[PDB]
Design a protein around this ligand. Structure first.
Ligand code: HEC
Length: 95
């Protein structure tokens, strides 16, 4: 899932040297995009959007990825239940 869904930017482990989406590492009592990313440098962290929830279930279930209200163009994925397994994997990795 994560491998092709949401690998391009993100990671989950290791290095986080560069670029992209830094790794989420744990979405179960997180507040915003918070990791050893730098990158939240002008929004989300200041908002402090709590990630331990129900609205997230929907927001992550859909190709939308946003507890804070909004949007879409991660971009025509669609479907089913990729998030379920992903959040499962993060549970096993984190919890
Ligand atoms: C590359 C274009 C991305 C894809 C594909 C997905 N995400 Fe993402 N995400 C991306 C970045 C660069 C960041 C860091 C902050 C920023 O916007 O600069 C994020 C962050 C998140 C977060 C943390 C909360 C936040 O920072 O807003 C979550 C919970 C998240 N992303 C989830 C997520 C999921 C589940 C995706 C597909 C199933 C996904 N993202 C795709 C960049 C990109």
């Amino acid at each position: 899932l994560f491998k092709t869904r949401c690998l391009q930017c993100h990671t989950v482990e290791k290095g986080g040297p560069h670029k992209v989406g830094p790794n989420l590492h744990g979405i179960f009592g997180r507040h915003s995009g918070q990791a050893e990313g730098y990158s939240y440098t002008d929004a989300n962290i200041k908002k402090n959007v709590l990630w331990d929830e129900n609205n997230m279930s929907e927001y992550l279930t859909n190709p939308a990825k946003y507890i804070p209200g909004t949007a879409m163009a991660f971009g025509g994925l669609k479907k089913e239940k990729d998030r379920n397994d992903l959040i499962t994997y993060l549970k096993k990795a984190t919890e």
